[PDB]
Amino acid sequence: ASINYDQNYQTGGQVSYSPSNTGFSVNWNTQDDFVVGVGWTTGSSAPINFGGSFSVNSGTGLLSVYGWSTNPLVEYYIMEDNHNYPAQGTVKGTVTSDGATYTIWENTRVNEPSIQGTATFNQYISVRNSPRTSGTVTVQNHFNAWASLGLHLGQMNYQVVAVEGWGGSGSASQSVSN
Amino acid sequence: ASINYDQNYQTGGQVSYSPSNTGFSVNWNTQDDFVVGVGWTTGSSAPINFGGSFSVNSGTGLLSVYGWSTNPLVEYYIMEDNHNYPAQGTVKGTVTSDGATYTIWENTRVNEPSIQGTATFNQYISVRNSPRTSGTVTVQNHFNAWASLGLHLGQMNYQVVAVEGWGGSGSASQSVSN
Numbered sequence: 609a610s611i612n613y614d615q616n617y618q619t620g621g622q623v624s625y626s627p628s629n630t631g632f633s634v635n636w637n638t639q640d641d642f643v644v645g646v647g648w649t650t651g652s653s654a655p656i657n658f659g660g661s662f663s664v665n666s667g668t669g670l671l672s673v674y675g676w677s678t679n680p681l682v683e684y685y686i687m688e689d690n691h692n693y694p695a696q697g698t699v700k701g702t703v704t705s706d707g708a709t710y711t712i713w714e715n716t717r718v719n720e721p722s723i724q725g726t727a728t729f730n731q732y733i734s735v736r737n738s739p740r741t742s743g744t745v746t747v748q749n750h751f752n753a754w755a756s757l758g759l760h761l762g763q764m765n766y767q768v769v770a771v772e773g774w775g776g777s778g779s780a781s782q783s784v785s786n
Numbered sequence: 787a788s789i790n791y792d793q794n795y796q797t798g799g800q801v802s803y804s805p806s807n808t809g810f811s812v813n814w815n816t817q818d819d820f821v822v823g824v825g826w827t828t829g830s831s832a833p834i835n836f837g838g839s840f841s842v843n844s845g846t847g848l849l850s851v852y853g854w855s856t857n858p859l860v861e862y863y864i865m866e867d868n869h870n871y872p873a874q875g876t877v878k879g880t881v882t883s884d885g886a887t888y889t890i891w892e893n894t895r896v897n898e899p900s901i902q903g904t905a906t907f908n909q910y911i912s913v914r915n916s917p918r919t920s921g922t923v924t925v926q927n928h929f930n931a932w933a934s935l936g937l938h939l940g941q942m943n944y945q946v947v948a949v950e951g952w953g954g955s956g957s958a959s960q961s962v963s964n
């Protein structure tokens with residue numbers, strides 16, 4: 609498509625984010641959560657390509673296609689990689705997509721910050737069983753699998769490839785496209 | 787004692803906070819959560835006096851003694867007033883203190899921002915059954931009641947009289963001391 613959205617969220621500590629036309633770079637050393645990455649203002653069904661490096665020296669680190677949905681309000685993740693990630697919520701099932709199987713989870717965030725202000729909403733997460741830092745993510749396979757398990761999505765809002773972390777340091781240089 | 791701590795937390799929208807030597811003032815119109823108020827760097831057992839106004843035109847609004855504790859990490863509230871507050875967690879019991887009864891709740895915040903960075907910790911809340919905007923809060927009565935129900939506190943960290951809100955507008959002018 610063409611990246612037209614820059615996800616830049618951070619609460620504290622050392623987070624050096626460098627967005628670009630074809631991707632982004634991040635170096636961090638923080639105790640606080642941050643979500644940075646690049647993508648699109650309105651997500652679609654187009655298979656998303658990502659690639660590069662993603663190192664987590666310590667703490668929690670996640671590399672994933674991240675996004676939102678409205679009516680209902682939904683925060684979703686399709687984790688291609690994760691370290692020291694406190695698996696929260698309820699497992700719903702699985703979906704085999706793009707070279708590996710993903711365990712699907714549903715979680716709820718009460719009075720949490722969102723694109724609609726602080727609200728309560730659900731999370732639809734797909735965690736890859738075989739972590740990678742390079743590949744393609746056929747997003748429709750996840751949306752279909754989510755819908756079939758009762759994980760209902762609304763209108764598509766932004767959709768980015770993001771790195772999220774806290775409790776340590778690490779770095780990532782990723783190329784994003786679709 | 788003498789106010790030596792200024793609680794100033796906010797995530798977005800219109801929040802006009804004005805701290806002072808004997809209290810604070812706030813006018814807001816936001817969808818995002820904010821916690822502002824004044825107090826002390828290290829909380830004690832000293833009965834806290836508060837007084838003034840606290841109007842909530844719309845959305846969620848809470849007037850309460852707010853604080854933290856370390857080892858274990860604990861966020862506590864002693865709500866003297868609240869509007870449209872999504873009572874979250876588990877009721878534990880009650881405590882009669884300073885002219886009214888309070889319903890005690892215990893809740894857990896997973897991967898939430900804290901004084902120790904983003905962490906998972908419990909909340910000990912005392913919600914006054916008869917809301918007020920002026921009075922004294924004998925904090926020990928709450929700490930004793932909390933301990934007796936298994937709500938264990940650690941080392942005292944900051945302790946302020948704060949106003950917290952989201953989803954609307956309102957204003958508050960409070961005098962703080964102990």
Ligand SMILES: [Ca+2]
Nearest residue numbers: 662689690739
């Ligand atoms: Ca990895």
Ligand SMILES: [Ca+2]
Nearest residue numbers: 840867868917
């Ligand atoms: Ca009131």
